[PDB]
């Protein structure tokens with residue numbers, strides 16, 4: 001009736017029942033675990049070419065409506081009944097249905113709340129929702145996206161927000177943001193063979209170039225928004241530079257750190273995921289919260305296939321960068337992490353260290369178990385890329401399952417898209 | 422026909438087919454992952470009260486014999502046939518069978534090779550095997566265990582070894598080491614309420630005390646061996662102090678580190694696991710390799726429920742131990758890790774840093790895929806407790822499955838044991 005879960009730091013035990021509401025089969029098999037796979041099909045919601053079979057839709061819609069009304073302090077059965085009926089009718093007369101703004105808001109929060117890989121979920125109920133289900137052109141998308149960036153950035157005082165574009169109709173008119181994230185730096189393969197900027201965006205950068213974007217060949221060139229509306233070919237749009245807030249990296253003691261000429265954007269916005277709710281699918285709905293220091297200090301700046309600055313920082317610290325056992329990498333990466341936090345702080349930009357975030361999640365997870373007997377969590381993603389066991393999340397056993405509403409991954413658009421011309 | 426696996430640092434792809442040889446259902450379900458569970462039933466091989474049904478044994482024995490002979494450079498079908506027959510007959514006439522020493526050696530290495538949670542597997546073929554399947558008394562066990570400790574310790578030049586005691590017969594005469602590891606420090610709850618030594622061994626310490634062991638109330642009291650032979654009640658045995666090599670912790674710059682009065686044993690020996698091979702089960706077979714710095718520097722010294730020295734080291738470094746975001750914990754734990762490595766090195770004791778170990782495993786995993794198209798690996802256990810993404814293993818997708826031979830966990834003996842008197 002419940003899965004037993006234990007925290008080996010406190011010895012605390014928790015009983016998980018929420019996993020019963022899980023959906024289709026997860027990642028792992030019966031006699032094999034694929035937990036460390038980044039993009040398993042179980043987390044991907046692909047494209048369709050026909051509407052959702054009414055036999056499948058109705059039940060899901062009924063479930064969501066019940067979940068929605070069941071979330072109120074004081075019930076409202078009459079409204080609940082009426083809503084259940086209005087939806088059934090709309091589905092019969094239109095072959096689909098529309099969510100009320102409140103329903104939409106409710107769904108975006110629950111989906112966030114149901115994100116196994118998100119460590120900032122204690123903030124789940126604090127989300128600004130921008131309703132753009134009325135959008136129809138690429139240009140309109142772009143304006144909505146700019147309004148989102150501006151609202152969220154808030155001149156350093158970051159605010160969590162999400163923009164919901166039109167829901168998938170027949171799957172032939174999907175609104176899609178071809179970008180992985182709203183703000184991201186370009187990556188160029190230079191003439192001399194070296195790579196400039198973020199090597200991670202090499203292909204995508206080229207794609208923008210192929211679509212008429214002008215390469216500026218810098219180390220931190222903010223890529224353009226590639227927008228696809230109503231299923232039409234994607235159009236390119238440069239982001240107004242004024243909208244992109246950046247932080248210059250400075251160390252609180254090493255004056256030579258700024259000599260590294262590094263910086264990073266302040267807005268962490270996921271741009272390519274799909275919001276699934278009550279049978280409906282929103283192929284385009286960018287959302288953001290605020291950065292956790294390690295993403296920049298460790299992944300962006302230290303992954304070898306990214307900006308890869310670890311060795312450089314090593315030498316400038318006078319460490320034995322030629323002997324692994326000297327643990328110079330451990331010393332280097334920490335100073336870098338200290339630089340990131342120090343910088344966002346000095347420039348008054350919202351950011352969170354991984355220690356504080358982990359404790360935050362632990363409190364959240366505990367709240368969730370009391371509140372609903374479960375919290376889908378992916379240990380592999382929740383444990384920071386540094387200081388693993390130093391954080392409490394590391395000693396917490398977790399259960400990973402897919403509920404609904406949910407934020408799914410999607411097949412890269414350029415691999416399934418049918419160009420007009 | 423194969424599971425696709427990718428390394429996001431090199432972009433390299435690997436095809437896993439070895440997982441086809443997997444056994445019963447693994448940890449995770451169909452629509453739920455329990456990868457972060459420490460002791461799932463899928464990894465535990467419990468007690469029996471009756472022999473292994475011949476219908477189950479024979480097939481397994483046949484498989485192992487085939488695997489064994491199939492591992493030679495130049496085949497030897499005649500011997501292979503003869504062996505297949507001799508085993509079948511032995512099973513029919515005795516209801517079980519005995520492995521040849523070479524078979525046993527082969528099995529202990531493969532089992533090691535098949536350990537998903539072991540990062541030092543590149544050393545798999547380098548293992549000293551002590552055949553104690555002739556043992557019969559607790560006293561004899563103890564002598565074998567002492568010989569193992571002495572051989573493995575080798576005065577600092579650690580050598581990997583395993584001691585195999587009698588295989589389970591009817592499950593009523595199991596040889597069992599009640600200890601989790603051969604060398605481990607006692608933990609005492611003092612009169613004033615504080616805890617002295619290793620809080621992790623509080624219960625077990627009490628159990629030894631209840632069995633007639635004398636508590637020395639020190640911070641580093643090596644617990645006694647609790648041995649169970651031929652299924653009889655466990656007998657206590659103090660380990661000859663001369664056999665336990667220890668390292669005094671010293672920092673290469675902070676002279677006040679030795680003032681912490683810390684030390685740790687040099688021998689990392691797993692004492693409570695069961696070796697499964699060709700249908701046979703060896704409930705007692707301690708084994709060891711050599712330490713990886715982080716186990717001591719991070720888990721033993723920094724886990725809050727263990728020696729918990731992090732804050733202390735923090736203050737002595739003059740860090741802002743009152744502000745998490747200052748990342749003092751990241752700075753403290755690294756100096757501690759540096760202390761551990763520096764100390765084992767100065768005292769000429771074999772030890773490995775986590776960076777070097779990770780690269781070692783990456784090479785191994787690569788070898789394994791070429792050699793046999795797979796390598797069971799548990800990402801959650803293979804990624805060090807610090808410097809996660811700084812190590813290559815972190816960016817490597819992995820498949821976790823149970824093959825055979827295998828090293829299983831067992832139910833704690835004191836929970837299923839039937840005392841004589």
Ligand code: HEM
Pocket residue numbers: 108112115117118119120121123127160161162270287288289290291292295352357407
């Ligand atoms: C308020 C502050 C927030 C913090 C500090 C936080 C932090 C994080 C971090 C560190 C990650 C890891 C990203 C990676 O490794 O690629 C993440 C992932 C994620 N977050 Fe949050 N988050 C916040 C808000 C949000 C919001 C507002 C939503 C949605 C409405 C959300 C949805 C997700 C999802 C779905 C993922 C998974 C991304 C993926 O699968 O690539 N987060 N978050």
Ligand code: HEM
Pocket residue numbers: 529533536538539540541542544548581582583691708709710711712713716773778828
């Ligand atoms: C030669 C050096 C070796 C190194 C550096 C190495 C390192 C490690 C490390 C760091 C762990 C993690 C332990 C924990 O977190 O509790 C581990 C686990 C393990 N090792 Fe190795 N190992 C070595 C040799 C061996 C040998 C000789 C065997 C067996 C014959 C072995 C079997 C295992 C098993 C089964 C585990 C899992 C333990 C558990 O589930 O609690 N290792 N090893």
Ligand SMILES: COc1ccnc(NC2CCN(C(=O)c3ccc(C#N)cc3)CC2)c1
Pocket residue numbers: 120181183184200267268269270287288289290291292295300
């Ligand atoms: C939704 O709320 C939050 C809150 C805090 N962090 C995130 N992380 C996201 C992932 C990291 N992000 C990137 O842009 C990125 C992603 C990948 C690579 C590479 N290879 C390089 C950079 C910002 C968005 C989301």
Ligand SMILES: COc1ccnc(NC2CCN(C(=O)c3ccc(C#N)cc3)CC2)c1
Pocket residue numbers: 541602604605621688689690691708709710711712713716721
């Ligand atoms: C087989 O080969 C190797 C090679 C390198 N490391 C290991 N690790 C093992 C686990 C760590 N070990 C402990 O004794 C221990 C275990 C648990 C706790 C606690 N709570 C405290 C201490 C040494 C054995 C095995």
Ligand SMILES: C[C@H](O)[C@H](O)[C@@H]1CNc2nc(N)[nH]c(=O)c2N1
Pocket residue numbers: 035036037038380381382429815816817818819
């Ligand atoms: C292979 C590994 O699955 C992927 O490298 C990991 C682990 N955890 C992560 N955790 C977060 N939060 N973000 C990540 O990219 C990854 N990737």
Ligand SMILES: C[C@H](O)[C@H](O)[C@@H]1CNc2nc(N)[nH]c(=O)c2N1
Pocket residue numbers: 008394395396397398456457458459801802803
């Ligand atoms: C909950 C978590 O499953 C357990 O804390 C973890 C993760 N990985 C580990 N990895 C190793 N190598 N040893 C461990 O004890 C643990 N425990």
